Subunit: 103 residues, 5 copies
Amino acid sequence: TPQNITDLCAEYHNTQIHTLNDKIFSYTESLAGKREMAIITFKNGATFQVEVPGSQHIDSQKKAIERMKDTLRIAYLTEAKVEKLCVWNNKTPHAIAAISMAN
Amino acid sequence: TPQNITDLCAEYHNTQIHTLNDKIFSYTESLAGKREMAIITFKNGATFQVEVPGSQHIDSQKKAIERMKDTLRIAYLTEAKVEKLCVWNNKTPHAIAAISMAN
Amino acid sequence: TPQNITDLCAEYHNTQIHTLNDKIFSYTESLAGKREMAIITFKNGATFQVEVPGSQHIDSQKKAIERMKDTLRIAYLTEAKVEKLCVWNNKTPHAIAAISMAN
Amino acid sequence: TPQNITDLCAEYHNTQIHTLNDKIFSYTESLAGKREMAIITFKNGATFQVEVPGSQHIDSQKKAIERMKDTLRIAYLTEAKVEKLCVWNNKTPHAIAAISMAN
Amino acid sequence: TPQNITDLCAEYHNTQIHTLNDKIFSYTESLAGKREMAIITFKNGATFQVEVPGSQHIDSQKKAIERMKDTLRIAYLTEAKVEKLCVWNNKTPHAIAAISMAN
């Protein structure tokens, strides 16, 4: 049972940690069919997605995907510093699995 | 898989990008029957809706329509700069498909 | 396809626009049985309700009623100026159908 | 249909109004089984609960119970003044039925 | 019903109170499958989780688990002082059962 985002990230294949220590520079969200997703960027250009829910996801992830888009939106609006993202690197943009925020 | 709102918008027929770079001027929302919708305007007069859920929508868009109304309200209340809207232009007001926020 | 709250309000019988251009003075909400409602007031004495969900409402309005109470709470707490309310004036207090906020 | 919290409260047995005219001093929330509740206090020593959902609640109260806990949390965090609480006084701590915020 | 977090915590086996009297240092959440959880830390090094929902949880705890992650996120972003945590100590990190916020 993970103590931190790095240990959590290590439990999965196709993942990596991005260390940002920066606020989110842009927040995009779509309701368009088959693109019901969010995209964030940081000021250096690095871009990340919350994937459209699909068959790669188990049912328990569905609530967590909605929570993650809520978290990214409020992090963006509050200018909260993102410490790290755990992402799947077999997608473009890389797909967010987890986020850590620290000051 | 789109990197940004402009590329996302270009995946759909009957769409266009509006570049606002401005906060929302007014936020309206209704619970009246068959008009369960939100309307926003900008200082330049541009007006946009989040459509009432209807037969044009697929199931996966339902939660996303609700999220979009949540996003517009908090964006309005925080005076968040809206960068771009991707809209369907076969409706009046033009119907929001996606939003980007950045400074 | 109304472009504003006034035109939206005119699509319905037994409604009127109240122009407040003021923040909410008080916010009240209840979980008591058969009084699951919100009440707001303005400094000029005007009092409005979000009605308890009932048989007068169609199913699509249910989520919108919940959203309206969310909107009123956060408007109150942020001291956001309410521009107009569309209300049914065949209820006492007048029952909120729509709200517009503008600076 | 009541115009204020006091009139609403008077529609029920085993209730009373507490006047606080103060912000919440502490907010406590639990996910422990059979104690999925919230407790608030004020600096005068007064303590109130939002009861665990139970047999005494009708279906329409369920969403409103959840809303009330949302309300108390955000009230606490924004330091919003609570005017009055309508409570059931046949429970210890007294159980919140309604809240008004003003001033 | 208990009047405070300490009395509530005492109703359960394998629990203890931690007194923090400090804001949350870091907030982490994950949507990865089977690790749909949150982790928080404090500057003293203390680490706590909100557990993945599982068969150890009764139906009524599922909504409360979601609420708790909402609470920790907003507490973190607002820099709200956490007074105490009631936790289960038969998990690592210790698993949050309840939270109190004061000062």
